[PDB]
């Protein structure tokens, strides 16, 4: 248009396609954090980072 | 405090002992389980003293045997050098000669001229002090009496003794002397103290009967050194204990008849001492309420790490007590790369541990 319409400019007309990454990013960020935290746990405790995967899965 | 012989049998624990060896103690747990319930007559600490080579280990063993306490063997400097699979870090040769190579009582006796001796001189006090907390742990959990052959309270005797000989540094004497206060304030003094008194010559007779290639042939054993024990025990060490703990002094162990010592101790009761609380004697054991019992209990069953961390004292003003960085770096490399030290105990799977990939457990005050 040639008309700076505030409402129509704001309206959810669409054209917003999520990436394969767009929704998945948070799951593979928080889980990556928690997995790394468990590795952090064992790293300081002088325990095998691999060991006790129950902590990592949880 | 009362002998089995007068019991006509064994003593019983008044209530089920708490698994303090393998279980953590919580403030929640204190609310859920009372403390002085288990406590009984024998819930007390009988410390022993004597001039060196007094053979009191067998005495204390039998004394705890026939009065039903714990023996708690004596200082074991090697435990620094021991690990989950035993072997001696003394095995590790002088790769890092200056201040990483070991120093046991053997090395001290062979030569107290080495500044590195001061290492154990303080680490030996820590070992006593750590043992003392172990004794308090066993008391407060089980309510059973304990008997420590020697105490951190008494350790300064040898300290000032070695310094008077000149072996320790003027710097080290200050370090240890001030540093005792920091931790020694945080321990309960023993109920009863028994000190054994041979002369310097007499102990030399017996130490020559010990026939120890790292002591009997050694050179430290001057009358002055082995006598400084006598003066320090006599006045410096005894008096404060004489204020708090009840003091008995027989001649010595050899003539020390266990049964009369049994009877003399038993005759000395403490219900007599259940008078005015403000009395300074037995002072460190007047616990008003079950809650205050639990405060002491949790403070030892859940704050041993806190107890150890008091030792963290910064003093880089003493050269023999400082370590070379890069050498110390390598000393770190050796210890934690050497067999059975890579991980926490039970997780040195390189040296044999199985059950890993699921095991996530750790023991109460389990070392690290
Ligand atoms: N530098 C130093 N050495 C000590 C200290 N306390 C004990 N030792 C040394 C001196 C002794 O040669 C050695 C222990 O020998 P002992 O005379 O205690 O043998 P004992 O017959 O008393 O039986 P036991 O030691 O209890 O198995 O450790 C200390 O506080 N500082």
**Distance from B350 to chain A by nearest Cα, in Å?**
11
Contacts of B185 (CB under 8 A, 6+ apart): none
* Nearest-angstrom CA–CA distance, B271 and B117: 45
Written as six digits, the tokens of B225 are 């050194």
Written as six digits, the tokens of B73 are 């063997």
Q: Best interface-test mutation with B: which of A43, A46, A49 has the largest number of B CBs within 10 A? A: A46
Q: Best interface-test mutation with B: which of A49, A50, A52 has the largest number of B CBs within 10 A? A: A52
* Nearest-angstrom CA–CA distance, B204 and B113: 22
**Distance from B80 to chain A by nearest Cα, in Å?**
18
Can you tell me which atom of ligand 1 is nearest the CA of B157? 30
* Nearest-angstrom CA–CA distance, B309 and B296: 18
Do the Cβ atoms of B77 and B123 come closer than 8 Å?
Answer: yes
3-class DSSP state of B106: helix
Written as six digits, the tokens of B232 are 């320090």
* Nearest-angstrom CA–CA distance, B368 and B354: 20
- Tell how far the Cα of B194 is from the centroid of ligand 1, in angstroms: 17
Do the Cβ atoms of B152 and B132 come closer than 8 Å?
Answer: yes
Experimental resolution (Å): 3.7
Contacts 24+ apart (CB under 8 A), B347-356: B347/A46, B347/A47, B347/A48, B347/A51, B348/B84, B348/B85, B349/A48, B351/B84, B351/B85, B352/B85, B356/A48, B356/A51, B356/A52
Whether residues A52 and B360 touch (CB distance < 8 A) is answered with: yes
Residue in chain A nearest B348 by alpha carbon: A47
Nearest residue to B203 (alpha-carbon basis) of B54, B45, B310: B54
Residue in chain A nearest B344 by alpha carbon: A46
Whether residues A53 and B356 touch (CB distance < 8 A) is answered with: no
* Nearest-angstrom CA–CA distance, A22 and A24: 6
In this structure, which residue's CA is closest to atom 9 in ligand 1? B105
* Residues of chain B neighbouring A48 (CB-CB closer than 8 A): 343, 347, 349, 356
Q: Which structural technique was applied?
A: cryo-EM
Unique residue bearing structure tokens 């003493």: B318
Pick from B342, B347, B368: CB nearest A51:
B347
* Residues of chain A neighbouring B357 (CB-CB closer than 8 A): 50-53
Contacts of B135 (CB under 8 A, 6+ apart): B45, B70, B72, B146, B148
For a mutational test of ligand 1's pocket, the pick from B48, B51, B53, B252, i.e. the residue with the most ligand atoms closer than 8 A to its C-beta, is: B53
Written as six digits, the tokens of B323 are 């370590």
- Tell how far the Cα of B343 is from the centroid of ligand 1, in angstroms: 33
């Amino acid at each position: 248009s040639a008309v700076n319409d505030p409402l129509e400019l704001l309206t959810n007309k669409g054209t917003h396609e999520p990436s394969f990454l767009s929704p998945i990013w948070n799951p593979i960020a928080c889980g990556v954090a928690g997995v790394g935290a468990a590795i952090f746990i064992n790293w300081g405790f002088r325990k095998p980072v691999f060991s006790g995967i129950q902590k990592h899965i949880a | 405090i009362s002998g089995k012989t007068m019991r006509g049998g064994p003593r019983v624990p008044k209530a089920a002992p708490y698994p303090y060896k393998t279980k953590k103690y919580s403030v929640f747990n204190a609310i859920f389980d009372k403390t002085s319930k288990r406590f009984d007559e024998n819930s007390k600490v009988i410390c022993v003293e004597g001039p060196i080579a007094a053979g009191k280990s067998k005495f204390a063993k039998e004394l705890a045997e026939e009065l039903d306490m714990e023996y708690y063997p004596a200082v074991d400097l090697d435990l620094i050098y021991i690990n989950s699979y035993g072997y001696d870090m003394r095995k590790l040769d002088p790769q890092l000669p200056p201040s990483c190579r070991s120093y046991d009582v053997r090395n001290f006796c062979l030569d107290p001229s080495h500044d590195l001796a001061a290492q154990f001189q303080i680490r030996m006090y820590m070992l006593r002090y750590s043992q003392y907390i172990d004794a308090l742990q066993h008391v407060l959990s089980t309510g059973q009496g304990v008997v420590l052959e020697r105490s951190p309270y008494s350790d300064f005797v040898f300290m000032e003794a070695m310094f008077r000989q000149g072996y320790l540094s003027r710097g080290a004497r200050s370090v240890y002397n001030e540093l005792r206060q920091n931790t020694i304030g945080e321990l309960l003094k023993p109920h009863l103290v028994i000190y054994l008194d041979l002369p310097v010559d007499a102990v030399k007779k017996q130490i020559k009967a010990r026939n120890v290639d790292y002591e009997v042939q050694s050179k430290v054993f001057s009358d002055a050194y082995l006598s400084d024990l006598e003066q320090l025990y006599k006045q410096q060490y005894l008096k404060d204990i004489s204020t708090h703990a009840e003091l008995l002094i027989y001649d010595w162990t050899a003539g020390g008849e266990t049964e009369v010592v049994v009877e003399d101790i038993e005759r000395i009761d403490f219900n007599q001492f259940e008078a005015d609380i403000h009395n300074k004697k037995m002072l460190d054991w007047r616990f008003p309420l079950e809650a205050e019992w639990c405060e002491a209990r949790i403070k030892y069953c859940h704050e041993k790490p806190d107890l150890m961390n008091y030792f963290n004292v910064p003093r880089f003003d003493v050269p023999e007590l400082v370590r070379s960085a890069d050498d110390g770096k390598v000393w770190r490399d050796v210890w934690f790369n050497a067999p059975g030290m890579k991980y926490r105990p039970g997780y040195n799977a390189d040296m044999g541990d199985e059950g890993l990939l699921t095991k996530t457990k750790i023991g109460i005050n389990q070392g690290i």
